[PDB]
Amino acid sequence: ADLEDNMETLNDNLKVIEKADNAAQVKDALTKMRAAALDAQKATPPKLEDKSPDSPEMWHFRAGFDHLVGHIDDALKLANEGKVKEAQAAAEQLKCHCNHCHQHYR
Amino acid sequence: ADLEDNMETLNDNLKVIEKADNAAQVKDALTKMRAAALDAQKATPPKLEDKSPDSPEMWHFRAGFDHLVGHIDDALKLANEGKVKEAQAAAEQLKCHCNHCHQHYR
Ligand code: HEC
Ligand code: HEC
Ligand code: NI
Ligand code: NI
């Protein structure tokens, strides 16, 4: 799956979570988001073709995915506690990660 | 000044940026926030009062301030280039840094 497929999976499932009202719905959507984030985690965007792996910009780009995956994981644990509304609030806070990386790197 | 003082400074000046009557007040508020962030990085938050300086939690807490300072610096550069509306827009995005760290540790 390419970067665009992964990003639309992230986009759509954020809205599934908002639309949802039970724990299984939120868990399933976060699980889909986690897989999409992990899929996109390790590859290079266009605007960073000629960059070392440890260069500051690539470092921060990959750090963005790592941190998004951590907070998807944290939202998943709340869904697994049956804490639907907390997990929904955590998922909404994920939008910060989306915009931060986009403003840097897209 | 303690961590509560620093957070007041951050809260008041982030509002000042949103409400600034002139472009110069934006830069002044960013400058005060930068100092507040670096001071706060030297404190121990109450919810981590038992953790060693080497804990993963204290690491993420300190790192949040570095990243906040980095984006403050980006906004300062914009304000210093005369792109003060762009600086003000960037400053509004700093709220994500507040929300993220608070979700963990406030
Ligand atoms: C970097 C660390 C990113 C994070 C975190 C997120 N996104 Fe992203 N996204 C990124 C890039 C570099 C790109 C452009 C890729 C390209 O080749 O153009 C994108 C793109 C999108 C898109 C566009 C989809 C399309 O069909 O064009 C969307 C809808 C999108 N990203 C959404 C999105 C969401 C909802 C995120 C957080 C939950 C998110 N992205 C994180 C880089 C990064
Ligand atoms: C961690 C990396 C943080 C960042 C970035 C920001 N804040 Fe924060 N804030 C943090 C903690 C650990 C705490 C709890 C402090 C305590 O002693 O309990 C807070 C608290 C606040 C508060 C309340 C302060 C109080 O007197 O109780 C405010 C008003 C606040 N924080 C504001 C704020 C803003 C606007 C930030 C972004 C610009 C911001 N903080 C960043 C940790 C962190
Ligand atoms: Ni975090
Ligand atoms: Ni950044």
Curated annotation (Swiss-Prot), chains A, B:
Binds 1 heme b (iron(II)-protoporphyrin IX) group per molecule. GO terms for molecular function: electron transfer activity; heme binding; iron ion binding. Residues 47-60 have a biased composition (Basic and acidic residues). It is found in: Periplasm. Its main location: periplasm. Its cofactor is heme b. GO terms for cellular component: periplasmic space. Residues 38-60 are annotated as: Disordered. The keyword Calcium does not apply. One of its GO terms (biological process) is electron transport chain. It comes from the Bacteria. Heme b binds at residue 7. Keywords: Electron transport, Heme, Iron, Metal-binding, Periplasm, Signal, Transport. Belongs to the cytochrome b562 family. Monomer. Electron-transport protein of unknown function. This is Soluble cytochrome b562. It comes from Escherichia coli. The gene is cybC. The chain holds residues 23 to 128 of 128 of the full protein.
